[PDB]
């Protein structure tokens, strides 16, 4: 369930296991120095059988490693206050008013803010002028009838903006 590929990798799965076990050992192990000791012990335990030339033995050790990890996890791991489940986790989703709005104002409030609305007008002209031919030709020129991936190509032909940029550039500041 990832945008660029279908399966992660074997190495990617071992690597996610390593980051999750190291994070849970952070949360388990306070005072940071016994943490550093146990983290180097874990790094050594990965080093002792990292260089095995098989593949079914690699997935064997991976599967038993998930067993002996899920035995020893921590109930409330220290997740950061931006991660899902965290303390904040879009705390300031109260104030992410999107920018398809702000055009439905009365013109007196538009007369209070001259320069920002003039520059929004020139950005909106830049959106409307460079939408049809360039973006739709690059989106209906390079793909096959099945796209088979979600990475979209940059604009490297001659000039202007990359395709499908508007609701990725004009997103809110995430600390308004």
């Amino acid at each position: 369930f990832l945008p660029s590929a279908a399966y992660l990798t074997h190495q990617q799965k071992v690597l996610q296991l390593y980051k999750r076990a190291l994070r849970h050992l952070e949360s388990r192990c306070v005072h940071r120095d016994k943490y550093r000791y146990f983290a180097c012990l874990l790094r050594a335990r990965f080093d002792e059988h990292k260089n095995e030339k098989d593949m079914v033995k690699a997935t064997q050790l991976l599967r038993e490693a998930e067993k002996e990890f899920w035995h020893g996890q921590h109930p409330q791991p220290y997740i950061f206050p931006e991660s899902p489940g965290g303390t904040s986790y879009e705390r300031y989703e109260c104030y992410k008013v999107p920018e398809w709005c702000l055009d439905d104002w009365h013109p007196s409030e538009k007369a209070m803010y001259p320069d920002y609305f003039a520059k929004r007008e020139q950005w909106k002209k830049l959106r409307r002028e460079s939408w049809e031919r360039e973006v739709k030709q690059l989106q209906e020129e390079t793909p096959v009838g099945g796209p088979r991936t979600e990475a979209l190509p940059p604009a490297r032909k001659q000039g202007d903006l990359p395709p499908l940029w508007w609701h990725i550039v004009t997103r809110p500041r995430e600390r308004p």
Binding site: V30, H31, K34, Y37, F38, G72, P75, Q76
Partner: peptide, 19 residues
Amino acid sequence: TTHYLKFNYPSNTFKFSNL
């Protein structure tokens, strides 16, 4: 004992008081 370094496994009373 938290000053020490042993890394004891939980024994599910830890779970019963932790979850």
